A paper describes a structure:
The TRMT10C/SDR5C1 platform in the RNase Z-HCCA complex is similar to the RNase Z-HS and RNase ZH548A-HS complexes, but here, ELAC2 pivots by ~6 degrees around the tRNA. Within the complex, a tetramer of SDR5C1 forms a flat platform that can be bound from each flat side by TRMT10C and precursor mt-tRNA. Thus, the SDR5C1/TRMT10C subcomplex can support the simultaneous processing of two tRNA molecules. Furthermore, the structure shows how TRMT10C compensates for the lack of strong D arm/T arm interactions in most bilaterian mitochondrial tRNAs by providing structural support through its extensive interactions with the mt-tRNA’s D arm. In addition, TRMT10C’s N-terminal domain stabilizes the T loop via electrostatic interactions with the RNA backbone. Here, the structures show that the NTD of TRMT10C binds to the tRNA T loop to stabilize its fold and facilitate the tRNA interaction with the ELAC2 exosite.
Here, we present several cryo-EM structures of the mitochondrial RNase Z complex (ELAC2/SDR5C1/TRMT10C) bound to different maturation states of mitochondrial tRNAHis, showing the molecular basis for tRNA-substrate selection and catalysis. The human long form of RNase Z, ELAC2, has two alternative start codons to produce a nuclear and a mitochondrially targeted form. TRMT10C is a purine N1-methyltransferase that acts at position 9 of mt-tRNAs using S-adenosylmethionine (SAM) as a co-substrate. SDR5C1 is a moonlighting homotetrameric short-chain dehydrogenase/reductase.
Residue numbers in the entry:
A (entry chain F): 92 to 164, 175 to 385
B (entry chain A), C (entry chain B), D (entry chain D), E (entry chain C): 7 to 261
The structure:
RNA sequence: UAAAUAUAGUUUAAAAACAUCAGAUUGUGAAUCUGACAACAGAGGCUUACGACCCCUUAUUUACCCC
């Protein structure tokens, strides 16, 4: 198209532009309908390759330092197979969790409210969240609900996980959480909820919205829990923490770690350690 | 050789029992499918041919098994082999502190009645039928093969009832073999691992796939035909008695 | 140490259960004798002093055990140890060709109900009681000790029912230990050999002397105090879990 | 099916090994008789026909086994099955107080070297040979079958050395199966009891004849062909792995 | 009671042997630390006081053990208890197809020599020493306690040599108990799981944390004092004989 | 209404460190290797550009509630 030549002049002005831009990145530049929108995307591409180059340069340096060290230069009970063994042990715990674990629902019904960038970050947070659950002493039985098979969220999940996706010990379904669990057992977590959570209940199914709203959309999560008459709760952030700055909507990885701590008989002081320290001045 | 032998196969309408029936009938034996009226055993018996009949019975019932053995004797004249493959399981923890949930006594009782009491009920009645047989040249009147599980040795979380029932089958294998030794009835037990049966298919697919991947070799669910092959080997080998054979691909079940 | 611990001992009015109560009470523990109303447990509890109470219950019934555990909680405030020593036996061959006699299903069921189902009934209910305990310094909330038999491994002629029940206890020891591991309840099983329990001391002297002579060393019937000593060792040792300990003087039972 | 398979049979000039060779060759397999130079294996190999060759070797020697496996590869092109049937026994008490006699260390060492170390020596070397095989449809590269004894579980008086060696074979069966699972080599162990081998006939006639009556059923010494039959069953069944099968007619050895 | 008893503790300079020595000496027994000269056995014996002496010996050597036992008799007058805790562990796969690496025969041999042959060497020589004791009121002349491993039952990848040696100890426990039963020497075996011995505690903290989490309950490495406690329980209990006790917190090792 | 503020895994600094995901049968620095991810609240602009500056939205905190 004309965009291939159009970007060329932008480089000459030194507007923080990457040297190499792949064709699939040019297609994403089509979505940028404004000068500012393009500027933010190029700045993203610039910083992406710059940290790639910086880490790569540190890789040849690391590789060179390793080979020089080796050139200069017993009874065991176990072979060193720990990473493999730990993965196997987690799988057994995961298998047990899918049969007896407490359900935790990640509601994937927020694709329409998220742009490309936000959807990417949602999957990153989901990857981290699942990892913390997998390694836990008492994992949740994670449910991915309202996950459309052909949707962008599903496609990105498959891309990040590759062949691991079919082997993840979680339940991913197109069906809603209301179709899988009794409505009285469902508690929809949202910071906008009027009801402040006091205790972690083991007989309840907590629902977390898979929704990274950098462009903040308050009440979207609460509205979903009111369209279908579901109970809502919010974290007692004000009750326990002297809040200073920042959004009170925490990330997915922070939420699951808070819930995991609470499920394992941790108190609110231990659980709220996963709230970013930059957002408060301590436990009141 | 199993040619001409008559086998009463408990739970023979599906899973391990059906695979045992198909193999034995294919090898020239006669089979009686002992299973519940709703099991669909009539269709399986018709499919296997004239050397297979369906005997509707509940193994927990003395009268039901007596009727089935009378049917077996009426059609084929004798009983040479009994294979106990009927079994149920529950997935229930003994006690869950977080949920405040206790394993039901009725759930434990139901599993024992079918798996353990049902097996013994068949054993004690088929032994009487086998006792009427004239001994062969080796002095043998019959072979009884029971189905335990690897859960009898490493039962998982939630498998207390199943493990108790299967551990009971393992426990009574040698005494019953000793009981029936004077009259020439061999008693053997197979402890299958993870097999492609409805008992395992009911689990979530992802759980089934992970468990199958954890079988050292071959890394797959057991094929029911493989169980049937071992059953035939036990029948043919006169010196296997009072033993439990693990058929599990070397798996050891974790919690 | 067992000082200050509260133990619920099923079948505690006689035999292994009584010896366990006498030792634990002598070592400073509190005992609840859970036995049948006609067992004479009231006299034994009175003999053992103020730190022992009699709780009439049938282990096979949920209501009776619940009442007994409520009595234990009311009297002593908590339950730390459960010792399952309640049990019966039958002597009956699976099938006797000469006499044309078949083991009754009722006899098999009765032994299973008391030995196996009764044990599980106590386990599942006491686990809920021990679950209410605050974990100790080692994270432990309780210890459950079951009584299997050597018959679970080499059951004699006529011991099919007993071997099945005891094989069931052995089978479910590990899964229940796995079930209760997050709660911090250790589950252990003792498999005693020939002990000088009232059942064996009432057996004919001809059989009794021979069986005592068949123990490699010491060549005598097991003293119930020796069972009690092992029970205490299990309670005191925090790392014994999910295991069956044979207490038999190295005997291996003949047919 | 074993047709076309190549089996290396240790101790194949007599006893269990020879019977295994006769069966497998009769079923269309090729056998390599690995036995001592003075064992008379050359005559046996000639008797079994063109599909059988004699490879003189001492299993305790790495070089001897390497030469034998090279002979097997040269003659038949591959190795699919290894059957470890070489073994020795010694009758010696650990300590005799009356005679003031102590078990010699060298007697214990010699039994371990042949039975236990010799088995491992063959396993570790044949695994390399089987590793060169292309996996079959089921991913299998070979099958290794070891011969333990019932002495691994109920060792008699004077069988300390033998029981240790056979207990070692049982102990390492699972780890080796786990070791070779990625390669697709199944590892199985047979634990025979009281077979009509020349070893058992070397005992006094009165003792062996009494031992025959001590087998519950059939009340006779094990036929070596019955061992061979089980070996074939293990080879044919893809899902038998990491397990010990007792082939003993339900006997449990007394002191 | 262990007061006044003399214990010969093999491998007593560290780990399970040292913990056993500390407990027994603390309970009023006399201990002889039998360990290699290069071990800090002399310092440990001096630390434990006048009731503990260091006897440098290699368990694989008949002469070394004879010298150590003579030292025990000279210092304390008799031997009442033998605890075999000396051992080595190697990790080596049987065969590695990708690397083309085969388990060394020498690696297998050296593990057997120390773990299995060394244990038997001590047993056969201490039995002679214990045979000279006057029997107690119970007819007992001594107690021998061996250390197997859970690897005897579920050996992991790379544990073939270790599992064989430990499986050999398990195998010979009953026959030796039967051998020494007329003499009145009890033979018992402990199969520890994961214990916080220096060999395990030297691992990276990431590995130590993972191993602790693998134990169902308590979710920690075994304390060597817990092993010592079980040793004392075995010594005090006259009816424990010919048995293997798993001390493992209900763990079952994965491949 | 006003003023400061706002790091979407975390923190530090004005780009790193720690983390995350996939692969690994690791001989005990795997203490590694190969990949994946890379967005300082959001939108729109200005400017040679800047994280600068100018606007609007949302959110947080502290004051203040009608002139
Ligand atoms: O101009 C706004 C707002 O600045 C002012 N206002 C709101 N709350 C306060 C307050 O507590 N103290 C003072 N001094 N001034 C305040 O009032 C105006 C109108 O109110 P808002 O627009 O903030 O609120 P409204 O309910 O109208 O909603 P919306 O217009 O924002 O949608
Ligand atoms: C970053 S929030 C999404 C915020 C969005 N504006 C909304 O309406 O919720 C991602 C999810 O985490 C959960 N969550 C985040 N912060 C929370 C809080 N403080 N209390 C309760 N749930 C919270 C909610 O389920 C939410 O959907
Ligand atoms: Mg954040």
């Amino acid at each position: 198209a004309a965009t291939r030549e159009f970007i060329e002049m932008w480089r000459l002005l030194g507007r923080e532009v990457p040297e190499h831009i792949t064709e699939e990145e040019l297609k994403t530049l089509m979505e940028c309908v404004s000068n500012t929108a393009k500027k933010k995307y190029l700045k993203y591409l610039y910083t992406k390759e710059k940290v790639k180059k910086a880490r790569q340069i540190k890789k040849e340096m690391k590789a060179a330092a390793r080979e020089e060290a080796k050139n200069i230069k017993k009874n065991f009970l176990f072979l060193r197979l720990w990473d493999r063994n730990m993965d196997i042990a987690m799988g057994w715990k995961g298998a047990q969790a899918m049969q007896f674990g407490q359900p935790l629902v990640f509601d994937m019904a927020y694709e329409n409210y998220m742009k490309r960038k936000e959807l990417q970050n949602t999957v990153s947070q989901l990857l981290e969240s699942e990892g913390w659950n997998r390694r836990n002493v008492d994992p949740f039985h994670i449910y991915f609900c309202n996950l459309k098979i052909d949707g962008a969220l599903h496609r990105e999940l498959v891309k990040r996980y590759q062949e691991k996706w079919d082997k993840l010990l979680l339940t991913s379904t197109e069906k809603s959480h209301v179709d899988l669990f009794p409505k009285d057992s469902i508690i929809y977590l949202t910071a906008d909820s009027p009801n402040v959570m006091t205790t972690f209940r083991h007989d309840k199914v907590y629902v977390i919205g898979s929704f990274v709203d950098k462009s903040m959309q308050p009440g979207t999560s609460l509205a979903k829990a009111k369209r279908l008459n579901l109970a809502t709760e919010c974290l007692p952030l004000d009750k326990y923490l002297q809040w200073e700055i920042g959004n009170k909507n925490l990330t997915l990885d922070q939420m699951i770690r808070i819930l995991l701590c609470l499920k394992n008989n941790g108190n609110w002081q231990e659980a709220l350690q996963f709230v970013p320290k930059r957002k408060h001045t301590g436990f009141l | 050789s199993v040619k001409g032998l008559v086998a009463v196969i408990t739970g023979g309408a599906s899973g391990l029992g059906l695979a045992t029936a198909e193999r034995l009938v294919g090898q020239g034996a006669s089979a009686v499918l002992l299973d519940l009226p709703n099991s669909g055993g009539e269709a399986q018996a018709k499919k296997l041919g004239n050397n297979c009949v369906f005997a509707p019975a509940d193994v927990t019932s003395e009268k039901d098994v007596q009727t089935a053995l009378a049917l077996a004797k009426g059609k084929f004249g004798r009983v040479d082999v009994a294979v106990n493959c009927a079994g149920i399981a529950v997935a229930s923890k003994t006690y869950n502190l977080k949920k405040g949930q206790t394993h039901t006594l009725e759930d434990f009782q139901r599993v024992l009645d079918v798996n353990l009491m049902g097996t013994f009920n068949v054993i004690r009645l088929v032994a009487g039928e086998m006792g009427q047989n004239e001994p062969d040249q080796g002095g043998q009147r019959g072979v009884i093969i029971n189905t335990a599980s690897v859960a009898a040795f490493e039962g998982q979380v939630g498998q207390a009832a199943y493990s108790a029932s299967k551990g009971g089958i393992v426990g009574m294998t040698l005494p019953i073999a000793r009981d029936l030794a004077p009259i020439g009835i061999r008693v053997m037990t197979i402890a299958p691992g993870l097999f492609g049966t409805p008992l395992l298919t009911s689990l979530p697919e992802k759980v089934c796939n992970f468990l199958a991947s954890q079988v050292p070799f071959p890394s797959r669910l057991g094929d029911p035909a493989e169980y049937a092959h071992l059953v035939q080997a036990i029948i043919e080998n006169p010196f296997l008695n009072g033993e439990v054979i693990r058929l599990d691909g070397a798996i050891r079940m974790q919690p």
